[PDB]
Amino acid sequence: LHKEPATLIKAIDGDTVKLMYKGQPMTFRLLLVDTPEFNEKYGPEASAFTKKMVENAKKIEVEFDKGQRTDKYGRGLAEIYADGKMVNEALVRQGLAKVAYVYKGNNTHEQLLRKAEAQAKKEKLNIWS
Ligand SMILES: Cc1cn([C@H]2C[C@H](OP(=O)(O)O)[C@@H](COP(=O)(O)O)O2)c(=O)[nH]c1=O
Numbered sequence: 001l002h003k004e005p006a007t008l009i010k011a012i013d014g015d016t017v018k019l020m021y022k023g024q025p026m027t028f029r030l031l032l033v034d035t036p037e038f039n040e041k042y043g044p045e046a047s048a049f050t051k052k053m054v055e056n057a058k059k060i061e062v063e064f065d066k067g068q069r070t071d072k073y074g075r076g077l078a079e080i081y082a083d084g085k086m087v088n089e090a091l092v093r094q095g096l097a098k099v100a101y102v103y104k105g106n107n108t109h110e111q112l113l114r115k116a117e118a119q120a121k122k123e124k125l126n127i128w129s
């Protein structure tokens, strides 16, 4: 795939972020993960983790996969990178996201994310405790 520039507009929760992409506002939903909603257990913690990651990054990049680029809600379906670090893998590896929502086309980093999940699970992190 190929990484593309974007600028942060605002953090939203663990797996959604509003970015400026191609000069336009756009809500992005992280591919291949599911963070708790804010009102749920580890919701505030996943929200804060993502917010930290995007806000402290000098460089935000987005990466579409080979399947669908936008969801039914108009949300961009991407890997988000913060100074080269994938936010999707970061959450899973700390047990703040479960691997979930695996569609054909958009599963390039599925096995990468699953690896991080086992590791969080063995370490009994957050969600897995
Ligand atoms: C992650 C992801 C979610 N979705 C849709 C399906 C789910 O629909 P429903 O809202 O009808 O359940 C919803 C889950 O996102 P949230 O986890 O943000 O709610 O977003 C996709 O279509 N493709 C995707 O890659």
Ligand SMILES: [Ca+2]
Pocket (backbone or CB within 6 Å): 015, 034, 035, 036, 037
């Ligand atoms: Ca969610």
